[PDB]
C-alpha cells in the first residue's frame, strides 16, 4: 500500500540527477547517491535500482532509502526510471530495454561516475526484479541509439521477489500468443528462467514464501536449476512473508534491515564491497 502511494515524479532528495536515455521524447533519468568521500578516479562497485509495479507504474523513491544504505557503504548507488504502461503506453519489452540502456549508460560513464565498470550490481523488486535479472541473463532484444560497443550486462544481481518466469513451455498457443501481445516480444525473450547457462554473474534472491502474486515455487525452480547449471545463486526464504515484504516502511523494517545486512553480506562474498570495518 505505502510503495502503492510513493510520488512520481519522485524527490529523491541529496541525488545527483543525470538523463541516461531519451526516447519517446521523454528523458529518463537516474538518481545517483554517491558516498561522502566520493572523488573523481574512484572506482568504486556501483548498484542500480529498479522499482516494482507491474512494468504499469511505480517511482525511484521506492528505492531510495537502499541508496543511502549503499553509498553510505562505499557505493555509487542509483535508482533508475524507467518507461511503464500507464506513462508511457509500453510493453515489457520495452521497459526490459530501458534497463539495459541504465547499465550500459552506467558502465559507459563508470570514469566520471567514479565507478568499476566489471563491478555493476543490478537490482529490483517484482517486475524491476525481472528487469535486473534480465540485465543479467537475457539478450539484448534490440539496439537502441546508444554505445553497442559496451556491454548492457550486469555483473551481479539483488532480486527482491522478482519475475522469473514468464512462458510456460517447458513446464496452450493462445497463452503464448496473449502473451507476445502483452510483452511486446516472444515470451522466452523476456523470461529469464528461460535462459539459464552456465558462466552467469553471481546473485542473491529474497522471496516470501506466502507471495500470492509469485508464486515461491518459480523461484525455487529458477534457483534449483541455476545451481545445476554452476551459478552462484542464493535463495533467502522469508517464512510467510508476502509480495513486497522487504520495503521500507514495512513490518517495524525487520525485513528491511535483514535483507540489506544479506544483501550486504553477498556483495562482500563477490569481492564488490569491502568487509564492514
Ligand atoms: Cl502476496
Keep these: ?16 540527477v543525470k538523463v541516461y536515455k531519451k526516447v519517446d521524447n521523454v528523458d529518463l533519468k537516474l538518481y545517483i547517491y554517491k558516498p561522502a568521500d566520493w572523488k573523481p578516479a574512484d572506482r568504486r562497485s556501483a548498484i542500480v535500482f529498479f522499482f516494482g509495479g507491474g512494468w504499469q507504474s511505480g517511482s525511484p523513491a521506492q528505492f531510495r532509502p537502499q541508496c543511502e544504505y549503499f553509498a553510505g557503504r562505499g557505493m555509487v548507488a542509483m535508482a ?11 510493453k515489457v519489452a520495452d521497459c526490459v530495454a530501458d534497463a539495459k540502456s541504465a547499465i550500459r549508460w552506467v558502465r559507459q560513464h563508470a ?23 534480465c540485465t543479467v541473463m537475457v539478450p539484448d532484444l534490440e539496439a537502441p541509439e546508444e554505445d553497442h560497443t559496451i556491454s548492457s550486462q550486469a555483473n551481479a544481481a539483488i532480486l527482491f521477489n522478482p519475475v522469473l518466469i514468464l512462458s510456460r513451455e517447458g513446464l496452450r498457443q493462445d497463452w503464448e500468443e496473449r502473451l507476445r501481445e502483452r510483452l511486446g516480444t516472444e515470451p522466452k525473450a523476456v523470461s529469464p528462467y528461460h535462459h539459464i547457462r552456465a558462466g552467469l554473474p553471481p546473485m542473491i534472491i529474497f522471496h516470501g514464501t506466502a507471495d500470492n502474486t509469485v508464486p515461491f515455487e518459480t523461484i525455487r525452480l529458477f534457483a534449483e536449476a541455476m545451481k545445476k547449471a554452476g551459478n552462484r545463486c542464493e535463495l533467502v526464504p ?24 544479506l544483501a550486504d553480506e553477498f556483495l562482500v562474498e563477490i569481492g564488490f564491497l569491502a568487509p564492514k570495518g
Design 111 to 133: 570514469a566520471e561516475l567514479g565507478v568499476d565498470p566489471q563491478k555493476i550490481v543490478a537490482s529490483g523488486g517484482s517486475a524491476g526484479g525481472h528487469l535486473a535479472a
Design 80 to 90: 533508475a526510471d524507467y518507461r511503464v504502461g500507464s506513462r508511457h503506453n509500453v
Design 1 to 16: 500500500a505505502e510503495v502503492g502511494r510513493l510520488r512520481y515524479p519522485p524527490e529523491m532528495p541529496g541525488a545527483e
Design 238 to 261: 522469508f517464512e510467510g512473508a508476502a509480495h513486497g515484504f522487504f520495503n521500507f516502511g514495512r513490518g517495524d523494517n525487520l525485513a528491511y534491515q535483514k535483507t540489506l545486512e
